[PDB]
């Protein structure tokens, strides 16, 4: 079985957090993130992975991963994936991408399926502080497999970047 147990709208990073440092310049480990181990409850052999999608415009790339634009001065490198931050998948493009290959809970037990979103800021144009306002980032959808069914359960949750300030 499967049930939606998380929230539809999720904020990434602490509200009004401040982070200190040729263009572009990359700043923050897992500070600017959202993590929740319990977004769906799954049981009895339900098999499930995750897809992710970023809606922000791509304004460049670094090492195979897109730089997503927020404003003229600030961009973002983004990762989406399973609960643990180290399992994040670097995002590229604006399409749904596989960000967690998946797992199956045992035939006779129960657990939960989680997710995480992480971003690190990139300075694109220098001006001595850069502030960004609350911005929609994208979404993550569960991906049942092995015959498992999404059914009527809510499949998608969204993410918004909480406002932040970058210090020279
Ligand atoms: C460690 Se069990 C279970 O594993 C799945 C797949 O890795 C993860 O998405 C869930 O967040 C986790 N639930 C917990 C920790 O409560």
């Amino acid at each position: 079985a499967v049930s939606f147990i998380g929230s539809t709208e999720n904020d990434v990073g602490p509200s009004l957090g401040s982070y200190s440092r040729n263009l572009p310049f990359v700043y923050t480990r897992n500070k600017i993130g959202y993590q929740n181990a319990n977004v769906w409850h799954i049981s009895k052999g339900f098999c499930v992975g995750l897809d992710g999608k970023v809606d922000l415009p791509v304004v460049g790339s670094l090492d195979g991963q897109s730089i997503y634009g927020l404003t003229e001065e600030v961009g973002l490198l983004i990762w989406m994936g399973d609960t643990k931050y180290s399992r994040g998948t670097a995002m590229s493009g604006n399409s749904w991408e596989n960000v967690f290959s998946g797992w199956c809970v045992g035939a006779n037990t129960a657990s939960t399926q989680g997710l995480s979103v992480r971003v690190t800021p990139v300075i694109l144009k220098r001006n001595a502080r850069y502030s960004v306002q609350k911005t929609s980032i994208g979404s993550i959808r569960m991906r049942p497999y092995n015959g498992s069914s999404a059914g009527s359960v809510q499949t998608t949750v969204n993410f918004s970047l909480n406002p932040f300030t970058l210090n020279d």
Side-chain angles (χ1 to χ4, degrees), residues 36-40 42 48 50 82-84 87 100 102-103 111-115:
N36 189 340
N38 322 113
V39 180
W40 289 277
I42 66 177
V48 70
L50 302 170
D82 193 27
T83 308
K84 288 177 190 182
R87 282 166 208 175
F100 172 45
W103 76 297
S111 189
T112 52
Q113 169 58 46
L115 52 77

Side-chain angles (χ1 to χ4, degrees), residues 1 7 66-67 71 73-74 92 116 123 137 158 163:
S7 298
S66 297
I67 290 161
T71 71
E73 300 168 342
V74 179
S92 281
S116 62
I123 295 299
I137 291 163
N158 312 307

Side-chain angles (χ1 to χ4, degrees), residues 23-24 26-28 30-37:
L23 295 161
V26 188
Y27 279 58
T28 50
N30 306 321
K31 293 279 195 174
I32 317 193
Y34 176 82
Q35 176 183 65
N36 189 340

Side-chain angles (χ1 to χ4, degrees), residues 30-43 45-61 63-71 73-124 127-166:
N30 306 321
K31 293 279 195 174
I32 317 193
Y34 176 82
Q35 176 183 65
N36 189 340
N38 322 113
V39 180
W40 289 277
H41 185 270
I42 66 177
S43 56
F46 196 86
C47 291
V48 70
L50 302 170
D51 293 325
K53 187 168 74 75
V54 181
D55 303 330
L56 294 166
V58 176
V59 301
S61 90
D63 299 294
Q65 131 172 240
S66 297
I67 290 161
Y68 289 95
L70 282 176
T71 71
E73 300 168 342
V74 179
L76 292 185
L77 295 175
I78 302 179
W79 293 259
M80 294 174 152
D82 193 27
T83 308
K84 288 177 190 182
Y85 283 118
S86 60
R87 282 166 208 175
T89 297
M91 298 301 289
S92 281
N94 297 125
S95 303
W96 282 107
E97 294 304 324
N98 174 7
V99 302
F100 172 45
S101 59
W103 76 297
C104 300
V105 65
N108 278 298
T109 197
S111 189
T112 52
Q113 169 58 46
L115 52 77
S116 62
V117 177
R118 175 170 76 86
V119 308
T120 63
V122 188
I123 295 299
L124 307 175
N127 60 39
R129 293 190 330 181
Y130 309 84
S131 291
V132 172
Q133 299 309 144
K134 189 141 172 42
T135 303
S136 169
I137 291 163
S139 306
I140 285 186
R141 59 175 185 205
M142 127 228 285
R143 184 184 69 256
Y145 65 99
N146 191 50
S148 283
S149 181
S152 49
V153 180
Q154 181 171 313
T155 56
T156 307
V157 304
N158 312 307
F159 301 90
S160 291
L161 177 71
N162 264 345
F164 64 65
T165 294
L166 300 185

